Design an enzyme around this catalytic site. Structure first.
Site, PDB file in Angstrom:
ATOM      1  N   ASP A 196       0.821  -1.185   0.000  1.00  0.00           N
ATOM      2  CA  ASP A 196       0.000   0.000   0.000  1.00  0.00           C
ATOM      3  C   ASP A 196       0.870   1.255   0.000  1.00  0.00           C
ATOM      4  OD1 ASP A 196      -3.008   1.053   0.634  1.00  0.00           O
ATOM      5  OD2 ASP A 196      -1.553   2.238   1.702  1.00  0.00           O
ATOM      6  N   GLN A 230      -2.578   3.903   4.614  1.00  0.00           N
ATOM      7  CA  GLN A 230      -3.988   4.056   4.941  1.00  0.00           C
ATOM      8  C   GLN A 230      -4.821   2.982   4.202  1.00  0.00           C
ATOM      9  OE1 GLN A 230      -3.236   8.889   5.077  1.00  0.00           O
ATOM     10  NE2 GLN A 230      -5.383   8.211   4.689  1.00  0.00           N
ATOM     11  N   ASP A 248     -14.361 -15.154  14.853  1.00  0.00           N
ATOM     12  CA  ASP A 248     -14.513 -16.602  15.067  1.00  0.00           C
ATOM     13  C   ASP A 248     -14.137 -17.425  13.839  1.00  0.00           C
ATOM     14  OD1 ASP A 248     -16.862 -15.875  13.558  1.00  0.00           O
ATOM     15  OD2 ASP A 248     -18.234 -16.591  15.093  1.00  0.00           O
ATOM     16  N   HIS A 280     -11.192 -19.874  14.184  1.00  0.00           N
ATOM     17  CA  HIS A 280     -11.530 -21.261  13.802  1.00  0.00           C
ATOM     18  C   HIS A 280     -10.450 -21.866  12.882  1.00  0.00           C
ATOM     19  CE1 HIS A 280     -14.470 -24.519  12.538  1.00  0.00           C
ATOM     20  NE2 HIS A 280     -13.586 -24.555  11.556  1.00  0.00           N
ATOM     21  N   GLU A 281     -10.156 -21.163  11.800  1.00  0.00           N
ATOM     22  CA  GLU A 281      -9.264 -21.696  10.782  1.00  0.00           C
ATOM     23  C   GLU A 281      -7.817 -21.750  11.265  1.00  0.00           C
ATOM     24  OE1 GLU A 281     -10.305 -23.308   8.364  1.00  0.00           O
ATOM     25  OE2 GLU A 281     -12.421 -22.717   8.283  1.00  0.00           O
ATOM     26  N   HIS A 328      -7.204 -24.850  13.247  1.00  0.00           N
ATOM     27  CA  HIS A 328      -6.844 -26.047  12.450  1.00  0.00           C
ATOM     28  C   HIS A 328      -5.338 -26.192  12.331  1.00  0.00           C
ATOM     29  CE1 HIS A 328     -10.708 -27.582  11.356  1.00  0.00           C
ATOM     30  NE2 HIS A 328     -11.079 -26.475  10.733  1.00  0.00           N
ATOM     31  N   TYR A 348      -8.971 -35.693   9.439  1.00  0.00           N
ATOM     32  CA  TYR A 348     -10.159 -34.945   9.059  1.00  0.00           C
ATOM     33  C   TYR A 348     -11.220 -35.836   8.422  1.00  0.00           C
ATOM     34  CZ  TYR A 348     -12.571 -30.501   8.165  1.00  0.00           C
ATOM     35  OH  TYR A 348     -13.445 -29.451   8.201  1.00  0.00           O
ATOM     36  N   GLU A 399     -13.006 -30.384  13.902  1.00  0.00           N
ATOM     37  CA  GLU A 399     -13.980 -29.257  13.751  1.00  0.00           C
ATOM     38  C   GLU A 399     -14.456 -28.595  15.035  1.00  0.00           C
ATOM     39  OE1 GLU A 399     -15.424 -27.226  11.423  1.00  0.00           O
ATOM     40  OE2 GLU A 399     -13.678 -27.899  10.254  1.00  0.00           O
ATOM     41  N   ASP A 442     -20.564 -14.569  21.385  1.00  0.00           N
ATOM     42  CA  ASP A 442     -21.676 -15.478  21.453  1.00  0.00           C
ATOM     43  C   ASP A 442     -21.145 -16.895  21.173  1.00  0.00           C
ATOM     44  OD1 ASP A 442     -21.486 -15.936  18.581  1.00  0.00           O
ATOM     45  OD2 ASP A 442     -22.265 -13.873  18.410  1.00  0.00           O
ATOM     46  N   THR A 469     -24.874 -14.066   5.719  1.00  0.00           N
ATOM     47  CA  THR A 469     -26.188 -13.550   5.265  1.00  0.00           C
ATOM     48  C   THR A 469     -26.487 -12.101   5.699  1.00  0.00           C
ATOM     49  OG1 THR A 469     -27.390 -14.507   7.157  1.00  0.00           O
ATOM     50  CG2 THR A 469     -27.238 -15.864   5.150  1.00  0.00           C
ATOM     51  N   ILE A 500     -30.186 -11.117   6.741  1.00  0.00           N
ATOM     52  CA  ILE A 500     -30.918 -11.855   7.790  1.00  0.00           C
ATOM     53  C   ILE A 500     -30.258 -11.665   9.167  1.00  0.00           C
ATOM     54  CG2 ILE A 500     -31.883 -14.144   8.502  1.00  0.00           C
ATOM     55  CD1 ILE A 500     -31.487 -15.009   5.452  1.00  0.00           C
ATOM     56  N   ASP A 505     -19.541 -34.820   3.501  1.00  0.00           N
ATOM     57  CA  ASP A 505     -18.826 -33.912   4.415  1.00  0.00           C
ATOM     58  C   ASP A 505     -17.766 -34.687   5.203  1.00  0.00           C
ATOM     59  OD1 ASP A 505     -18.244 -31.578   5.891  1.00  0.00           O
ATOM     60  OD2 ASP A 505     -19.797 -31.980   7.386  1.00  0.00           O
ATOM     61  N   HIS A 523     -18.553 -31.505   9.874  1.00  0.00           N
ATOM     62  CA  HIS A 523     -19.195 -30.249  10.258  1.00  0.00           C
ATOM     63  C   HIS A 523     -20.571 -30.487  10.874  1.00  0.00           C
ATOM     64  CE1 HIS A 523     -16.344 -28.845   7.049  1.00  0.00           C
ATOM     65  NE2 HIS A 523     -16.163 -27.837   7.894  1.00  0.00           N
TER      66      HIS A 523
HETATM   67 CA   LIG Z   1     -27.033 -12.898   8.848  1.00  0.00          CA
HETATM   68 CA   LIG Z   2     -19.594 -16.112  17.031  1.00  0.00          CA
HETATM   69 CA   LIG Z   3      -3.839   3.269   0.920  1.00  0.00          CA
HETATM   70 CA   LIG Z   4     -20.318 -12.371  17.782  1.00  0.00          CA
HETATM   71 ZN   LIG Z   5     -13.023 -26.049  10.309  1.00  0.00          ZN
END
Ligand SMILES: [Ca+2]
Ligand SMILES: [Ca+2]
Ligand SMILES: [Ca+2]
Ligand SMILES: [Ca+2]
Ligand SMILES: [Zn+2]
Length: 316
Positions: free
Chosen positions: A57, A61, A138, A142-143, A146, A157, A166, A185, A194, A197, A226, A231
């Site tokens: 960059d 900024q 999260d 999460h990843e 792993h 896996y 998982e 949470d 989403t 939603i 899966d 999962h």
């Molecule tokens: Ca959502």
């Molecule tokens: Ca969460």
């Molecule tokens: Ca920039």
């Molecule tokens: Ca959260």
């Molecule tokens: Zn995973």
């Protein structure tokens, strides 16, 4: 790259302003020299060739919308690094300060994020199912978890060990979200899932069944999709970890909650001292019981709560 450590500023995916550790050499790069052997963020430029180019960059900024996913990947990598170091005395994912590398803008409309054996990779989402996946702390933790699992237990896996692999990532991803303490949470991916939603996510740890996942061993998925349901069946372990932390009565079995810090201690110890590549659910229960016994004593509430939580989800 060789240069001086600097401090840039930008906006993440959700419009929040934050500082990022950068490195200056002609351009300002997304390279954080303050943690281990570096955190490095790259641009995949809508392609799938990895890692892409180290993010460069002109002015330090990072407020363009194109910047946002890289701002978050970089920053949340640093938060996850801090969690493992400060809470578990673990230095990066291999425990020896391995460089943490992430690429964003992977492919086009890619509704997913993953650890590929060597680095983090984040899609931008299609804007309907997902917005850029690095906007979820999260998801990032999460990843990265792993990577931690790959260097410790090495849980294969597939089938039960896969569902444990998982669950471990859902658990520490959630504990990292609580550590950072912004709207935490017990659901997974809600900040990036989403945009149209309210109140949904990919998975729930407190109520796996909300999204059709088993919350009891007698409901395990035994088919081949899966990778034998990695999962899907994680819901059983997620529910047990939720019970150990928060308490509750689940199918008539009461669990006394011991809180998040202790859950994190017990499961980190299980992960790093007791679990192996082929561990099944029953072996996880024994590892978690032995972990809790090492940490708090065999007559402890902590041990009794682990036993109750696994009883509640049908794991003997
Ligand atoms: Ca959502
Ligand atoms: Ca969460
Ligand atoms: Ca920039
Ligand atoms: Ca959260
Ligand atoms: Zn995973």
């Amino acid at each position: 790259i060789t240069g001086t450590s600097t401090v840039g500023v930008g906006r993440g995916v959700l419009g929040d302003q934050k500082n990022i550790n950068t490195t200056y050499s002609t351009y300002y790069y997304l390279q954080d020299n303050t943690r281990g052997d570096g955190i490095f963020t790259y641009d995949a430029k809508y392609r799938t060739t990895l890692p892409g180019s180290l993010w460069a960059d002109a002015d330090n900024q990072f407020f363009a919308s194109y910047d946002a996913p890289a701002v978050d990947a970089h920053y949340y990598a640093g938060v996850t690094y801090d969690y493992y170091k400060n809470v578990h005395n673990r230095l990066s994912y291999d425990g020896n300060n391995a460089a943490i590398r992430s690429s964003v803008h992977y492919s086009q409309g890619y509704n997913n994020a993953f650890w590929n054996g060597s680095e983090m990779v984040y899609g931008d989402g299609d804007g309907q199912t997902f917005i850029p996946l690095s906007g979820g702390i999260d998801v990032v933790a999460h990843e990265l978890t792993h990577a931690v699992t790959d260097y410790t237990a090495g849980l294969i896996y597939q089938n039960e060990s896969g569902a444990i692999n998982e669950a471990i990532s859902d658990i520490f991803g959630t504990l990292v979200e609580f550590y950072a303490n912004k709207n935490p949470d017990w659901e997974i991916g809600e900040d990036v899932y989403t945009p149209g939603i309210s109140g949904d996510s990919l998975r729930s740890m407190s109520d796996p069944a909300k999204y059709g996942d088993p919350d009891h061993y007698s409901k395990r998925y035994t088919g081949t999709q899966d990778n034998g349901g990695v999962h899907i069946n994680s819901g059983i372990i997620n529910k047990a970890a939720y019970l150990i932390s928060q308490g509750g009565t689940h199918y008539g079995v009461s669990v006394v909650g011991i809180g998040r810090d202790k859950l994190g201690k017990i499961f980190y110890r299980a992960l790093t001292q007791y679990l192996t590549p082929t561990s099944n659910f029953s072996q996880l229960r024994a590892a978690a019981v032995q972990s809790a016994t090492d940490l708090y004593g065999s007559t402890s509430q902590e041990v009794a709560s682990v036993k109750q939580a696994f009883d509640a989800v049908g794991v003997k």
